[PDB]
């Protein structure tokens, strides 16, 4: 089920935003926080300090939220949830949830391969027959 192709997939910035000076301290998480420091260099934009998030980094809104395969990812907990995306399968693809099972995961792999909807974490061997 070859995806709906979009325009060019160019990302504005691939490298993540990490908070200022988290490498020094082991408890600081790489997640972003906006520095409120008054003399803080990053807040003042010193050229060679880390860059902040803006409204300006948006993803182009055409290719936005599209995985590298060309499918916007819709989660699925059971074989009945495959039916919603039967019709739009050119656009959406399913993602089996983490907790869904070795037993239910057997079913959804079948009833996806029959309908031609695509699963990301669904077994790929039926596709590479």
């Amino acid at each position: 089920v070859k995806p709906v192709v979009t325009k060019s997939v160019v990302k504005k910035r691939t490298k993540r935003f990490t908070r200022h000076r988290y490498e020094l301290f082991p408890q600081l998480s790489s997640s972003w926080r906006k520095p409120r420091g008054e003399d803080s260099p990053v807040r003042r934009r010193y050229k060679g300090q880390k860059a902040m998030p803006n409204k300006g980094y948006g993803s182009d809104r055409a290719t936005k939220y599209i995985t590298p395969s060309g499918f916007k990812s819709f989660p699925i907990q059971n074989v009945q949830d495959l039916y919603m995306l039967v019709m739009q399968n050119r656009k959406y693809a399913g993602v089996i949830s983490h907790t869904v099972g070795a037993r239910s995961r057997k079913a959804i792999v079948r009833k996806a391969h029959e309908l031609d909807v695509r699963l990301i974490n669904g077994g790929a061997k039926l596709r590479k027959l």
Binding site: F74, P75, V86, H113, D116
Partner: protein, 146 residues
Amino acid sequence: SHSVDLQWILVRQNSRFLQKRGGIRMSNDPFNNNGNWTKRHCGFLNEKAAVVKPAKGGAICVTVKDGSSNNKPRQTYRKTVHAAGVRASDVSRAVAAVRPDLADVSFRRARRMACIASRTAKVAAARKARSEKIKFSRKSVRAKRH
């Protein structure tokens, strides 16, 4: 008398059929054609509706609402099977009799079910063709009952 206009403001942001996951809004309504969450596609909500729904082999059912038996449920949803080899414009033209809004989707969905069934036929054949070679140490059968 509870117009569709008024009921769509009520069920819009909360529902059994809403199913918004990961920022996407699909709809788990059985009467949606393509599955988007919008008025034209809410089957349970509208006063007249239709669906292209599969049946055995390649037959294409169509379920159809109408103004009149709108309450009284086993009587408000009426299914009619089209024959196996039915043209898709045949099914769409049925739906367009009831709800001309859906004339396009019912076509695309009519051709869709026809694709699925002939897809199930190739698959279920190829799975069993190579399922013979496998020696299973168990299998289960539900015993016929009288």
